[PDB]
Amino acid sequence: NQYYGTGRRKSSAARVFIKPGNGKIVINQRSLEQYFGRETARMVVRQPLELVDMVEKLDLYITVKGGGISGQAGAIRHGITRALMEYDESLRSELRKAGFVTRDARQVERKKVGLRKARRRPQFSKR
Amino acid sequence: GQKVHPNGIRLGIVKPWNSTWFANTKEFADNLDSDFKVRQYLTKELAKASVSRIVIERPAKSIRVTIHTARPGIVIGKKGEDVEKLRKVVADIAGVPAQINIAEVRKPELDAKLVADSITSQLERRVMFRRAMKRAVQNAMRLGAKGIKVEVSGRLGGAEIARTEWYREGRVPLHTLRADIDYNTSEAHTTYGVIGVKVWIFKGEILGGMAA
Amino acid sequence: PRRRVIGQRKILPDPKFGSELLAKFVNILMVDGKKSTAESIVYSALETLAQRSGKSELEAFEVALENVRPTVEVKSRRVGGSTYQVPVEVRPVRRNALAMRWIVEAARKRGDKSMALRLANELSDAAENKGTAVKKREDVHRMAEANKAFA
Amino acid sequence: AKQSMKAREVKRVALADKYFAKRAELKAIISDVNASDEDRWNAVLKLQTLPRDSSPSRQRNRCRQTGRPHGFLRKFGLSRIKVREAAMRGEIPGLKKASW
Amino acid sequence: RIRIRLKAFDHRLIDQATAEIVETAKRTGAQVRGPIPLPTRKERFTVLISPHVNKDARDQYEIRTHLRLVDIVEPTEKTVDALMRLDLAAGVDVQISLG
Amino acid sequence: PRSLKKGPFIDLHLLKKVEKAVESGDKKPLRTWSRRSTIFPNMIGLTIAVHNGRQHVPVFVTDEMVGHKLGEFAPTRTYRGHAADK
RNA sequence: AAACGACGAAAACUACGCUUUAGCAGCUUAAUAACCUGCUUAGAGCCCUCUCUCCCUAGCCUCCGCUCUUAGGACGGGGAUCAAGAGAGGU
RNA sequence: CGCGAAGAACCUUACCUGGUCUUGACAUCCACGGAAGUUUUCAGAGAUGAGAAUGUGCCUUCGGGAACCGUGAGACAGGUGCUGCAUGGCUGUCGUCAGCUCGUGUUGUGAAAUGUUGGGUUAAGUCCCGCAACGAGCGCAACCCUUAUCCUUUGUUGCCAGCGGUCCGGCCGGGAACUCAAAGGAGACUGCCAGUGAUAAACUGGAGGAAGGUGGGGAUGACGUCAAGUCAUCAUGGCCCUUACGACCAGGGCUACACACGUGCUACAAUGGCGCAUACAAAGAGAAGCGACCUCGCGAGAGCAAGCGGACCUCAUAAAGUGCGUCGUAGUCCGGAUUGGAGUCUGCAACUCGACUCCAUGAAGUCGGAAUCGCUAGUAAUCGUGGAUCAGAAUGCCACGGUG
């Protein structure tokens, strides 16, 4: 009956459950050493926990899908932020100050017609 | 190019389609080929009759073309014989049996296709384009249309250099997508080339979108 | 640029240490959006030169960077072939960025064993005021007094 | 397009459909590796015996209404200009301006 | 055992179709699992509307197809009589799967 | 190149000309518009007036050429000189 | 080089056509008017058509294809035609 | 100037060299003889010249009709022949700049002016104030499409909070909270709190919110200018030929010997290629089409093929990265351009003229002169994939994403 919070960054969905169990982390039937590649993702998926004292206070059974490594990290961060906010109702101010509640709405821009990229245009003919 | 066609910019919002059916592109090409054939046959046949529009539905192993016209009596005929006469040809062209519906259009001078029609006939019978367009726009304004815009281009009055004249009354909000901007085209084949005619008729602001 | 006075976008929190200046330095160093390789190289050079110097890592980086952070540069707001050059004192916001840009430009100038070793020498000698970035800074500073008729 | 060009399409498609029965059952012998070279060579020479435009590869895709080689859509069966005209006039069901 | 799939160009003509089929199934039978939607498909087309040399005048056209599925509610013989009725309004493709 | 499954490709009318040339009496060159027909040892010695676009050019067939198309020994466009070689 | 534009004072597609009133609207200092009008309410005299009001018959089918077949139906064929009339429409 | 051409071996294809036709390849009017049609022999590069075994199809009073061909013409058919300086339609540019006009009134005899200027303000003729101006239309915005949060309706092919077993696999019983599916709503509206300003408009900061001044993108492109581009998508007025500018076929050319220009790609190397493990996406396609698995293959692939009109099955272990060695600034384990040998797939047929695969060969280059191009945030760069026409043919085009 434990509640949880959901988080998305660009195109990835991560939902993380909160239980009283102290510091049992497994990210979609994996661990941080499994879903790794750079310390930045590991640091950013623990910032709400590393905020005051929640580093080893409640377990994290999240499973995340979609997006890339940074997208999954951001989704997990937003999910744990929302879960902590719903669990405590007093860490919301600290999370807003740290900029974790505000979900990053930025996504990839569409490719325009006539342009080689979203905004990059073909080189002008030397004129 | 300056203006996009005002129908296919609001077909998904306020305007209805002229062809309602489904395909999985196994038969989509032949379905539109059949629709094009029946539309051109109907246009070539009902020349004297003022046909407003042609909507086509294609249910399973059958079709239903609901012609909308201003004067349905000519197409109907005595005891409804002409429709039966011209139904078999459509049925055999489309393969599946047909069931032609005919709908009378109230206010025949307020339809875009109807107002774009017979001005080409006036030009063919040598009626001055300026007075013809003025009469058309004033009649449309009198009948109840909130805005009318008529453009005529190409070899006007049998001159040496073609131009583009236009008249406008009321308001014609071409940019908004919440109004009836019924628009149709027509061409006249005169003795010195071809004359293009365009008509925009704004009737009202349809609040709520599709399905009233 | 004309009517809008922009603010500033927040930088990465620098998970290893927490230095926004270090985050700016690694963002300048990285190219083609390949953060992982650039961060690994800068961390390796980070460790090598810190253990070569002996002092604290960041406490030595700051003193090596403040020793080639320029003070006054030369610009030219003239149109046409003829140009007049005016000295402008750099603000602290742009000072660190220009110093880091000079450091990373001078880094890719030695044929060492690896990019980390290329970074390490020219990063460590900045504390002792040697290398290429300091060499170009001590001439940029002279450019200001070369012709200071208009300022 | 040209009247002769349009007639070429139907003349090619008719002979391709008529000879489709022979073409497949004749290339089957060639495709079958478990066969003698004496019959493989006979099949190869017999395929060049029928008229040339008798294959689906020897026909183009001119639009039905007008006729245009360059520019075509298989799903709609017409060239780009005719497809655009039909879409703007509403002859193509469920076709509007894409904007995502 | 039996399922009905509905393909539509627009959701307006398919929501009413689903309502009609579920009310017919409620009249003849009960225990409906509700019409379940499926991921719609969006086929795109790029048409250069210029009839001559201009590779800057492009139009983006889209065909949307929405899928609805209705499963068994009560497998009997009377419940098939009211579902094998005449086809609905043109524009909705109905596929009947049995097994 | 062509797959070895189908083997060499020659024209149907070409085989009759080749057979008539060897059996019997070859004095006039074999006139063929076909250039995609592979060369065979039966044609060795015989003259082939291969069409290239303007007029048939004579080619004398030897044992060296066997696995090459007959149209290889037939230039498509005449080259004299790019710098106005008069 | 060149490029002007004056008359449905040829109401000209013919809705059966022609009437009064009922109110909106342009006309205006202001309330009528001529109407510029698209409808709404009323009567049809009438050029027109259809079911008709004649008689006979019970002609009546509909589920299971067809066979006397049941509750019930708004259900039902032939023939020359009208005096006036009960309703629908206008090729 | 990677333009029409979203993809030329014959097809497309018009041009050329060769051959044929004169009511024609493609219609209507016709007089006949046979329904057609199905295999086929030769000449021939084919176009078409002959020759056969044949079919003796369904229709009333039967001088018949569908319908099919052959002969003879006549109007006619035909043109990608020209005239975009006759045009219709469509499109590019200024420019998604913000202006362009009208009704009434007023001012000046009159061309004309006010309105539209002036003050703040803005993304803006957006608003306010003042003023012979008062209002309106085309216009800047909004309504339209996508996405950013939440609620509800309905859970298979989509998910596993809780339980049971296990072949430890969502496996299926089961569970309809969730990730998600696609419908309707709530939601951001300068709304509020202070300061500023002319007691306004409006601006600056912030308590709240996923969001702050248009939240982020797309569609929407006025009056008009450029005799702007298309009479070769199509239509159209004259002009031009009807034994030829028209009609059919075979082979070549659009892809070409001394060059210049334009738009892209590979790169230059130790940020790197190399050998072996290993994760992270989305959007689309599939019926003579996508094509699982097994086996031969160093390889493109080949026999076998199940499933799939597709949330089920495929295309299709995404790359960058990440782990470990290896290469030490080198004619380099760098670049794969050229060239020789032999093949694999699709196509009557790749010599002119596709691509993939092996072996070897290893051009330059070693950061580029004047002068220049795009981009202000998930944007520039860097990596991979899908899709359009398509028998095959992208380093192009059109979109998803990873990192950034």
Swiss-Prot record, chain C:
Keywords from the UniProt entry: Ribonucleoprotein, Ribosomal protein, RNA-binding, rRNA-binding, tRNA-binding
Entry keyword annotation includes Heme: no
GO cellular component: cytoplasm; cytosol; cytosolic small ribosomal subunit; membrane; ribosome
GO molecular function: mRNA binding; rRNA binding; structural constituent of ribosome; tRNA binding
Domain of life according to the entry: Bacteria
GO BP, one annotated term: negative regulation of translation
Misc. comment: The strain K12 sequence is shown. Has been predicted to contact the N-terminal domain of IF-3 based on footprint studies; exactly how IF-3 interacts with the 30S subunit is controversial.
Function field: One of the primary rRNA binding proteins, it binds directly to 16S rRNA where it nucleates assembly of the head domain of the 30S subunit. Is located at the subunit interface close to the decoding center, where it has been shown to contact mRNA. Has been shown to contact tRNA in both the P and E sites; it probably blocks exit of the E site tRNA. Protein S7 is also a translational repressor protein; it regulates the expression of the str operon members to different degrees by binding to its mRNA.
Family indicated by similarity: Belongs to the universal ribosomal protein uS7 family.
Protein name from the UniProt record: Small ribosomal subunit protein uS7
Gene transcribed to yield this protein: rpsG
Residue window of the full protein shown: 2 to 152 of 179
From Swiss-Prot, chain D:
Family, per entry: Belongs to the universal ribosomal protein uS14 family.
GO cellular component terms, semicolon-separated: cytoplasm; cytosolic small ribosomal subunit; small ribosomal subunit
PROSITE patterns assigned to the protein according to its UniProt record, in alphabetical order: RIBOSOMAL_S14 (PS00527)
Function statement: Binds 16S rRNA, required for the assembly of 30S particles and may also be responsible for determining the conformation of the 16S rRNA at the A site.
Annotated keywords: Ribonucleoprotein, Ribosomal protein
Top-level taxon in the UniProt lineage: Bacteria
GO biological process entries: cytoplasmic translation; ribosomal small subunit assembly; translation
Protein name, entry field: Small ribosomal subunit protein uS14
Gene label: rpsN
UniProt GO molecular function: rRNA binding; structural constituent of ribosome; tRNA binding
Pfam families, sorted: Ribosomal_S14
Quaternary structure note: Part of the 30S ribosomal subunit. Contacts proteins S3 and S10.
Gene3D superfamilies: 1.10.287.1480
InterPro entries (UniProt xref): Ribosomal_uS14 (IPR001209), Ribosomal_uS14_bac/plastid (IPR023036), Ribosomal_uS14_CS (IPR018271)
Swiss-Prot record, chain E:
UniProt entry keywords in alphabetical sequence: Ribonucleoprotein, Ribosomal protein, Ribosome biogenesis, RNA-binding, Transcription, Transcription antitermination, Transcription regulation
GO function terms (MF aspect): structural constituent of ribosome; transcription antitermination factor activity, RNA binding; tRNA binding
Keyword Transmembrane helix: no
InterPro entries per the UniProt record, alphabetical: Ribosomal_uS10, Ribosomal_uS10_CS, Ribosomal_uS10_dom, Ribosomal_uS10_dom_sf
PROSITE patterns in the record: RIBOSOMAL_S10 (PS00361)
Example of a GO cellular component annotation carried by this entry: cytoplasm
Keyword rRNA-binding: no
BP GO terms, sorted: cytoplasmic translation; regulation of DNA-templated transcription elongation; ribosome biogenesis; transcription antitermination
SMART domains: Ribosomal_S10 (SM01403)
Listed HAMAP family: Ribosomal_uS10
Family listed: Belongs to the universal ribosomal protein uS10 family.
Self-association state and partner proteins as the record states: Part of the 30S ribosomal subunit. Can also form a heterodimer with the transcription antitermination protein NusB. Binding of S10 to NusB is mutually exclusive with its incorporation into the ribosome. The rRNA transcription and antitermination complex (rrnTAC) consists of RNAP, NusA, NusB, NusE (this protein), NusG, SubB, ribosomal protein S4, DNA and precursor rRNA; S4 is more flexible than other subunits.
Protein name in the entry: Small ribosomal subunit protein uS10
From Swiss-Prot, chain F:
Taxonomy, superkingdom: Bacteria
InterPro entries in alphabetical order: Ribosomal_uS19, Ribosomal_uS19_bac-type, Ribosomal_uS19_CS, Ribosomal_uS19_SF
Presence of the UniProt keyword DNA-binding in the record: no
The keyword Ribonucleoprotein is annotated on this UniProt entry: yes
Result of changing residue 82 to Y: In MW145; suppresses a rimM deletion
Membrane-traversing stretches: none
GO BP annotations listed: cytoplasmic translation; ribosomal small subunit assembly
Keywords: Ribonucleoprotein, Ribosomal protein, RNA-binding, rRNA-binding, tRNA-binding
An MF annotation (GO) of this entry: tRNA binding
Example of a GO cellular component annotation carried by this entry: cytosol
Gene3D superfamilies: 30s Ribosomal Protein S19, Chain A (3.30.860.10)
Functional summary from the UniProt entry: In the E.coli 70S ribosome in the initiation state it has been modeled to contact the 23S rRNA of the 50S subunit forming part of bridge B1a; this bridge is broken in the model with bound EF-G. The 23S rRNA contact site in bridge B1a is modeled to differ in different ribosomal states, contacting alternately S13 or S19. In the 3.5 angstroms resolved ribosome structures the contacts between L5, S13 and S19 bridge B1b are different, confirming the dynamic nature of this interaction. Bridge B1a is not visible in the crystallized ribosomes due to 23S rRNA disorder.
Oligomer status and interactors: Part of the 30S ribosomal subunit. Binds S13 and L5 and cross-links to the A site tRNA.
PANTHER family attached to this UniProt entry: RIBOSOMAL PROTEIN S19P FAMILY MEMBER, SMALL RIBOSOMAL SUBUNIT PROTEIN US19M
Family: Belongs to the universal ribosomal protein uS19 family.
UniProt-recorded name of the protein: Small ribosomal subunit protein uS19
Species this protein is from: Escherichia coli (strain K12)
